[PDB]
Design a protein around this nucleic acid. Structure first.
Ligand SMILES: [Mg+2]
Ligand SMILES: [Mg+2]
Ligand SMILES: [Mg+2]
Ligand SMILES: [Mg+2]
Ligand SMILES: [Mg+2]
Ligand SMILES: [Mg+2]
Ligand SMILES: [Mg+2]
Ligand SMILES: [Mg+2]
Ligand SMILES: [Mg+2]
Ligand SMILES: [Mg+2]
Ligand SMILES: [Mg+2]
Ligand SMILES: [Mg+2]
Ligand SMILES: [Mg+2]
Ligand SMILES: [Zn+2]
Ligand SMILES: [Zn+2]
Lengths: 100, 80, 152, 152
RNA sequence: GAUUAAUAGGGACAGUUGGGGGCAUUAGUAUUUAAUAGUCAGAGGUGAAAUUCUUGGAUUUAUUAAGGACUAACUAAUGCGAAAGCAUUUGCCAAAGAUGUUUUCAUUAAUCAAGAACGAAAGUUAGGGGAUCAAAGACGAUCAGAUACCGUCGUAGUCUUAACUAUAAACUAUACCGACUCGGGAUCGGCUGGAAUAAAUGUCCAGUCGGCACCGUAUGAGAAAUCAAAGUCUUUGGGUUCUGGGGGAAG
């Protein structure tokens, strides 16, 4: 019973692909296989934002607080446990560009 | 409606040269007039390396990948 | 870097140039090619500098760049782009003082020029000077440190 | 298809001979004149193939045999300028030798060792042919040292 | 007196293309350490903690330097390589496919016991090197017991010259050459026309050859999962090597 045709990794036309340590655990995982999400968040709770934006010395800031950029790479055990990815029915299992 | 025996021209022209019925090539031969000394020479369509007109030694064509670049004011006609 | 103390206030000379994390990861997008170009140059001022340049593939085709909208430039085109950028910088470096060079470097002049050189090979977007390092700096005579000060 | 590349080697490079066997109408060269040119080129030390190219690009001669009735090599043979070792084998050995050359110096280069194995393989494989078909002396062998002095 | 000239194969040549290989070069932060400045009482680590480190000043901050690795992000159902595998700059060396040919050779080909070239990791021999991790080991914790999962350390190893070794779930678990059977966009590399502009190593459009795939679909296949081959098989024969014959014993 082959489960995935992909077999989980995006890799074809090559023998080998570089291994990445998982953010959460640090387990080595295939760069194709890895669940990778790029995150641009803000360093600060919106309330906290109000508080700081009051006190910003340079008034020449328009959204003059930096965003935090993360390239997040999960091994599978981690990204499942941690709900980044979750179990779906056989038909949906092949759906490719899902979010909102 | 389609007949293999009487294939349509515009179609065969679109097909790859080996996949036509008569298996006919895409190349031509052209008479080229040197911009300077006004000599006429024959040049293969996809010709390899470079061509210099015999009279004045100036450059007529440049090689590529199946195209020849006719350089400058050199005028040409296909021979057929 | 502080070259001099005068009377309770410390004068400084040029040391380096650089970029915020933000302004970098700002510019980094998937589905285009990331070009980087490093150069080593001498001023007539007697400085040895190392300039890192950054550039990105500019999409023309008018869609939203995506998995479908792939923008990559051929590796060879990248190489020609390096060669060209690099060359131009070394030239514009040898003919200028470090005052001149730094002024030009901070501002948008070189980005304009670089786009104009580069465009043949490939259209580029947000050309940037990622960093500048000063490899070898001469000591300043009282004269040149006075001429650096020269403020209007 | 492409010899000794298993898995994916397989594609079609072009040549497609037209239907008309008769030489073209615009062509004014006597077959004799052609044989003259081809032999001049030959004595200049060209290849039957290289001669073919020259006649085709420069001289408006599309197919030499459809003009003369004799293919290029046969012409060369009759008229006595002959390429002693077949152009075919000649190039294969030139190659195997260039690989010898580069390989004596970089002894850690594995790909080139393997490529050499392949090329020599083809050389022997061609030797057998040209031997059984009497185009090569019967005791003729390709060795490193023997073939290196062999006109290549 | 020389059959064509295989949408057979070898060779020539032309513009390319590639994270293929070998030498040199070269960068980049990062870990670790040192130096020089600072400042102080806690750093570490965990589920809590304890081993550790700390006033001889740690962690922390700034600037340099040493030393081994490693090439992030761009990075993809993209590329190359026979496979193993391959990702910084530049230069050199030989090599390669595809495409383009109204070039040349003319069956030179397919597959393959012998016999050979490779072949991750771990491991072995003789030198180097030693920053990071880290089998063994030493300890902390956890536990009824932990010679385990966790933590602090740490040797061989990890890297490198010469050599051995030949093995993997070395995986599409799918032999190679060749035909033929559906549809659709897209993608990487050539080429051919066409179009727009700010006129080009860039766009777009339409062809086509070759790659990696994908999405539909089969009145084709299958025990099914599924498969555009795993189809053209009792309507059973295109060519060729290899392997299996209930389970264990037993590689
Ligand atoms: Mg593997
Ligand atoms: Mg495109
Ligand atoms: Mg074929
Ligand atoms: Mg360093
Ligand atoms: Mg690529
Ligand atoms: Mg040792
Ligand atoms: Mg207890
Ligand atoms: Mg440790
Ligand atoms: Mg065009
Ligand atoms: Mg069956
Ligand atoms: Mg059925
Ligand atoms: Mg399907
Ligand atoms: Mg059968
Ligand atoms: Zn993990
Ligand atoms: Zn002329």
């Amino acid at each position: 019973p082959v489960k995935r045709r992909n077999a989980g990794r995006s890799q074809k036309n090559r023998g080998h692909t570089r291994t990445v340590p998982c953010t959460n655990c640090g387990r080595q995982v295939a760069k194709d296989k890895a669940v990778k999400r790029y995150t641009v968040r803000d360093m600060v709770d919106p309330s906290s934002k109000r508080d700081i934006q009051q006190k910003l010395a340079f008034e020449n800031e328009k959204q003059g607080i930096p965003k935090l950029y993360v390239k997040l790479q999960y091994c599978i055990s981690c990204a499942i446990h941690s709900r980044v990815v979750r179990v779906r029915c056989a038909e949906d299992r092949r759906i490719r560009r899902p979010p909102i | 409606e389609r007949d293999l025996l009487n294939p349509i021209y515009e179609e065969e022209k679109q097909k790859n040269k080996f996949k036509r019925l008569i298996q006919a090539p895409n190349s031509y031969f052209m008479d080229v007039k040197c911009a300077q000394c006004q000599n006429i020479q024959m040049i293969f369509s996809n010709a390899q390396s470079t061509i210099i007109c015999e009279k004045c030694s100036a450059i007529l064509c440049k090689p590529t990948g199946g195209k020849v670049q006719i350089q400058a004011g050199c005028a040409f006609k296909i021979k057929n | 870097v502080i070259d001099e103390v005068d009377g309770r206030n410390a004068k400084t000379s040029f040391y380096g140039l650089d970029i915020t994390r933000d302004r970098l990861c700002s510019m980094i997008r998937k589905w285009q090619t990331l070009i980087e170009a490093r150069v080593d140059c001498k001023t007539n001022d007697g400085y040895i500098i190392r300039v890192f340049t950054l550039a990105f593939t500019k999409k023309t085709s008018a869609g939203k760049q995506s998995s479908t909208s792939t923008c990559y430039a051929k590796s060879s085109q990248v190489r020609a782009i390096r060669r060209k950028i690099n060359t131009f910088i070394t030239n514009e470096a040898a003919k200028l003082g470090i005052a001149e060079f730094s002024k030009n470097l901070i501002g948008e002049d070189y980005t304009k020029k670089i786009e104009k050189e580069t465009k043949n090979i490939f259209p580029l977007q947000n050309i940037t000077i990622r960093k500048v390092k000063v490899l070898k700096r001469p000591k300043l005579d009282a004269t040149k440190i006075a001429e650096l000060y020269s403020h209007e | 298809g492409r010899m000794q590349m298993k898995g994916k080697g397989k594609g079609i490079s072009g040549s497609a001979l037209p239907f008309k066997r008769r030489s073209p109408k615009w062509l004014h060269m006597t077959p004799s004149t052609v044989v003259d040119l081809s032999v001049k080129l030959a004595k200049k030390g060209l290849t039957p193939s290289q001669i073919g190219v020259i006649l085709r690009d420069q001289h408006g001669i599309p197919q030499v045999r459809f003009l003369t009735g004799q293919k290029i090599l046969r012409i060369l043979k009759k008229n006595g300028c002959a390429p002693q070792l077949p152009e075919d084998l000649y190039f294969l050995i030139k190659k195997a030798l260039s690989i010898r050359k580069h390989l004596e110096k970089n002894r850690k280069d594995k790909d080139s060792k393997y490529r050499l194995i392949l090329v020599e393989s083809r050389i022997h494989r061609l030797s057998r042919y040209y031997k059984l078909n009497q185009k090569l002396p019967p005791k003729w062998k390709y060795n490193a040292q023997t073939a290196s002095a062999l006109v290549q």
